[PDB]
Amino acid sequence: PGNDLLESLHKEQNRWYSETKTFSDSSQHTGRGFEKYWFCYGIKCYYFVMDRKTWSGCKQTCQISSLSLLKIDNEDELKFLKLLVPSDSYWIGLSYDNKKKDWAWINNGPSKLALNTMKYNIRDGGCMLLSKTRLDNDNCDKSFICICGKRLDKFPH
Amino acid sequence: PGNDLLESLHKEQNRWYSETKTFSDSSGRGFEKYWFCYGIKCYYFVMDRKTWSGCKQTCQISSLSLLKIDNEDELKFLKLLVPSDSYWIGLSYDNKKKDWAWINNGPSKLALNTMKYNIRDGGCMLLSKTRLDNDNCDKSFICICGKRLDKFPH
């Protein structure tokens, strides 16, 4: 049972992409379209906004669509995310702001997740991305695909 | 193998069940439900075991539908995600046509191995852990109702 999941993960992935693939506009920068896609896993769904944009654009786009930019909940969600995501980087709700002088998830929301701060040289960025390889830091202002983030709370439909 | 990842599939199954079942789990007893999603589909497990056809019904009166498996992959996962019980998959023996079928036409790329099940054994397929396996449309089981969702969960 190792790769039978991979084999599949990967595939179910390219699969949900093309079923959910849309070029639509956001009624913020209105009639200008951008490509985006989604899929769910567990109690969370993930919506990717593929017009590369920056950590603050990402953050606001997620809020205008009624979501909020990815909080990762535990190492297992982290672990799944890195596996079904294409090969890339993406903004999530992890960064620095100012009284607390530490990273917070875009709301002072909770994760049960290790990280360990001292793995990241601030002088290196103030915003958290993903790769397939782990989490890293970059400048809140260069441009990447964002993932928004919704925690289902009742069973859709 | 035996894997960190299988292992994580298993923690993840406990969090979801824990998130969605119905009781404050105050360490009495209970017989309820849980669910989770996968791709563009959620899975509602109903715990009161029940007739196949009594499973057909629940899924209906819930505007769900006893699970249809769109394909090999969704199966290698549910196979490995789900714990080993036996659950009513919504594939059976067709009112008429001399073959097993998917509750309501079939579009499935699940390509049924057909000439390996014994009707002698039952006309209702289930997922029982090893693969699918048929028993008796009224051995009473865990139902799995699904939904294809068409839009982002509003």
Side-chain angles (χ1 to χ4, degrees):
Chain A
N3 270 247
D4 347 302
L5 219 10
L6 270 79
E7 315 176 60
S8 297
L9 275 13
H10 303 107
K11 307 190 53 262
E12 281 273 76
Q13 203 279 156
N14 320 259
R15 187 140 40 204
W16 309 327
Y17 176 69
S18 8
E19 322 152 331
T20 59
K21 225 270 338 184
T22 275
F23 194 52
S24 61
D25 66 328
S26 203
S27 44
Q28 294 271 74
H29 224 112
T30 192
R32 187 182 165 242
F34 78 98
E35 195 88 325
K36 61 194 214 171
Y37 99 80
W38 66 268
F39 67 66
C40 307
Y41 186 91
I43 42 340
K44 285 259 267 344
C45 306
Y46 301 98
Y47 176 80
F48 310 69
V49 171
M50 317 247 285
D51 164 12
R52 284 148 324 245
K53 219 224 230 19
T54 60
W55 192 83
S56 170
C58 281
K59 183 231 218 77
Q60 308 276 327
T61 295
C62 285
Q63 302 188 205
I64 109 228
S65 320
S66 282
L67 302 179
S68 168
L69 228 189
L70 201 50
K71 52 320 219 67
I72 305 199
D73 302 340
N74 37 76
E75 134 185 43
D76 306 302
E77 170 169 33
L78 176 61
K79 269 58 204 65
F80 281 95
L81 265 13
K82 310 208 248 277
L83 296 292
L84 40 233
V85 162
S87 348
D88 211 307
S89 296
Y90 312 78
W91 277 151
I92 74 263
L94 198 55
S95 83
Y96 204 114
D97 183 286
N98 294 293
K99 152 73 163 50
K100 275 89 198 127
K101 307 153 179 175
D102 217 350
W103 305 73
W105 279 96
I106 164 294
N107 209 29
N108 266 207
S111 137
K112 274 162 296 137
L113 160 71
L115 26 67
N116 164 214
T117 40
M118 126 219 334
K119 193 182 174 187
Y120 315 110
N121 191 182
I122 301 279
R123 288 158 11 245
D124 232 344
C127 276
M128 274 303 316
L129 301 155
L130 276 103
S131 179
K132 283 223 153 295
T133 109
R134 23 111 248 271
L135 302 198
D136 213 4
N137 62 251
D138 213 331
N139 297 319
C140 299
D141 97 354
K142 64 203 268 52
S143 255
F144 290 121
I145 275 173
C146 338
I147 319 185
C148 308
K150 143 99 161 139
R151 347 163 164 276
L152 294 191
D153 85 74
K154 298 173 172 6
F155 172 101
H157 143 321
Chain B
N3 259 291
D4 61 321
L5 152 169
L6 216 57
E7 173 72 29
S8 224
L9 209 60
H10 311 154
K11 280 99 143 16
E12 274 307 52
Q13 186 283 338
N14 305 352
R15 270 181 224 290
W16 304 342
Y17 162 90
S18 156
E19 284 155 1
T20 51
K21 63 108 109 91
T22 275
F23 287 103
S24 218
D25 214 75
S26 50
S27 62
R29 58 144 120 253
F31 233 56
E32 104 253 85
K33 298 115 274 173
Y34 88 108
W35 51 271
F36 64 81
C37 322
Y38 177 78
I40 69 195
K41 275 188 86 206
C42 310
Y43 293 104
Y44 195 86
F45 290 59
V46 199
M47 252 78 223
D48 326 78
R49 324 187 289 308
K50 300 179 174 155
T51 42
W52 195 74
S53 99
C55 276
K56 176 167 99 40
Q57 288 128 14
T58 35
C59 309
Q60 247 42 107
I61 80 179
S62 46
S63 345
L64 308 182
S65 134
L66 194 190
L67 187 84
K68 18 54 203 71
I69 308 202
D70 315 88
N71 65 59
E72 92 89 338
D73 289 302
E74 162 188 22
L75 167 105
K76 302 276 204 285
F77 181 70
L78 303 161
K79 230 135 102 159
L80 272 182
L81 180 265
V82 183
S84 178
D85 211 288
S86 17
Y87 318 71
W88 283 138
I89 275 14
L91 163 88
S92 81
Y93 215 78
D94 46 15
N95 281 279
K96 278 16 256 133
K97 215 92 228 334
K98 325 299 225 167
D99 206 316
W100 284 105
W102 265 121
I103 172 170
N104 291 217
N105 223 198
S108 154
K109 292 184 283 132
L110 203 88
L112 35 260
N113 263 318
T114 259
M115 102 197 330
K116 278 291 155 267
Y117 306 98
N118 216 359
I119 298 65
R120 273 178 353 98
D121 284 306
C124 279
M125 202 114 31
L126 65 51
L127 194 264
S128 186
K129 164 57 95 178
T130 57
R131 329 315 192 303
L132 331 301
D133 227 35
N134 55 336
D135 268 7
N136 283 299
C137 321
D138 57 40
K139 264 262 68 193
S140 212
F141 294 134
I142 287 157
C143 311
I144 304 168
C145 306
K147 176 60 182 101
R148 208 187 331 293
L149 334 121
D150 54 323
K151 87 177 153 184
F152 184 75
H154 232 197

